Amino acid sequence: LLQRQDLPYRFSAVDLDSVDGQRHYRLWLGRPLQAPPAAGYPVVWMLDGNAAVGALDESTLRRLADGDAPLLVAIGYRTDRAGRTFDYTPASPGQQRDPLNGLPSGGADAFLDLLRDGMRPAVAAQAPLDTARQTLWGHSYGGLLVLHALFTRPGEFARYAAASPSLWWRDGAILGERAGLEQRLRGKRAELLLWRGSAEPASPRGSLKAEPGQAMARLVDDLRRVAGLTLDFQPLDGLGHGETLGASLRLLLARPAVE
Q1: Which residues constitute the catalytic centre?
Q2: How many domains does the chain have?
Q3: Is 148 considered catalytic here?
């Protein structure tokens, strides 16, 4: 697909390194043949970029070319479990290791800084972006990162899309960051899209502390009532964890474009 020349999108890549030199990104850019509007393309940023590219189908891309098509940016690695684990997980207080796999964790804010300060200018050199019309999508740990971005910097993206976010991570640590969201959101608007497959376990540990769906339903019931936040939860009946990656992306891309 990236090599294809006959679609209403063309694909190019740019490379960026992390500030520490240890992680090596490759951003795959899908640019519509359509001229951008005055204010720039709306932009869909995708984490897990290598997997995301694999889930972009030709039918989806053709429908996207509707007269207001988005620039697609898949943030991938040139190689990545270590990279993802570090980039997508929030830092704990004090003075960090992933509690399942033992790899370095806690790099989420460094990743979001790099997104803002390195990736966006790299992408803007290739195609004009409307920074008021940006979406951030991620699956699993990527969904954790999406929730971290919403909770700590709401409205920096117009639409947040978190598929099967790892809400279990570090005893539900992402849930602690939700406190104070109404305050940080004041005078701004955001949309949060959530997905979970009904055949998913509570965690990779199985279902020790809570029943499958419970953390999600509690999170939804909580965020449902937040002024300025438009919340859309879509359960995917009978889908397991792996399967919600492509499903969520197809369905995100079929939504009406960001206002």
Answers
A1: 140 (charge relay system), 200 (charge relay system), 241 (charge relay system)
A2: 1
A3: no
